[PDB]
């Protein structure tokens, strides 16, 4: 397919200890205040975090106060127009809201998804969501966890943004 939509979903964050990537408690309370930014990387999906485009340019997808393990259920959508792509990386940064610039992040996650022919449905109604997939973290792997899933489907060229 040369014109298709990639839909990814940040399903949830699970941080039962209430800790940052350096292993210390959020705000030294363990009462984390997650701010989730994200970017769907089609140009450098196999490169080190953060890929093609710096996290400073990412849009905010979700905020909560005093939620260690929030349900998120928010989508990050990009179109591939005029040709093929074989993978895409949903890059996610989670900070605590407090001392944004200074406190270590909660996490740096890479949700790498394949886009083989079988992964791109002929249309949105026949698209199947892939399974809930644990994103790869720079630190605290299996202690601070992010879950995402993707679907993809052909769209008319005139709707390909
Ligand atoms: Zn072609
Ligand atoms: Zn949990
Ligand atoms: Zn969902
Ligand atoms: Zn905080
Ligand atoms: Zn760090």
Residue numbers in the entry: 66 to 226
Question: Which lines from the publication concern this structure?
Answer:
We crystallized the putative globular domain that lacked the N-terminus 62 amino acids of g12777 protein (g12777-Δ62) and solved the crystal structures as two forms containing Mn2+ or Zn2+ ions at 2.30 Å and 1.60 Å resolutions, respectively.
A considerable conformational difference was observed between Mn2+- and Zn2+-bound forms in terms of the metal-binding site, in which Asp92 and Asp98 were commonly involved in Mn2+ and Zn2+ binding. The cysteine residues in this motif (C91 and C97) formed a disulfide bond in the crystal structure, suggesting that this disulfide bond may also contribute to this protein’s function. Substitution of the Asp residues comprising Zn-1 (Asp92, Asp98, Asp161, and Asp163) to alanine (g12777-D2A) showed a decrease in cell survival, indicating that this binding site is required for antioxidative stress function.
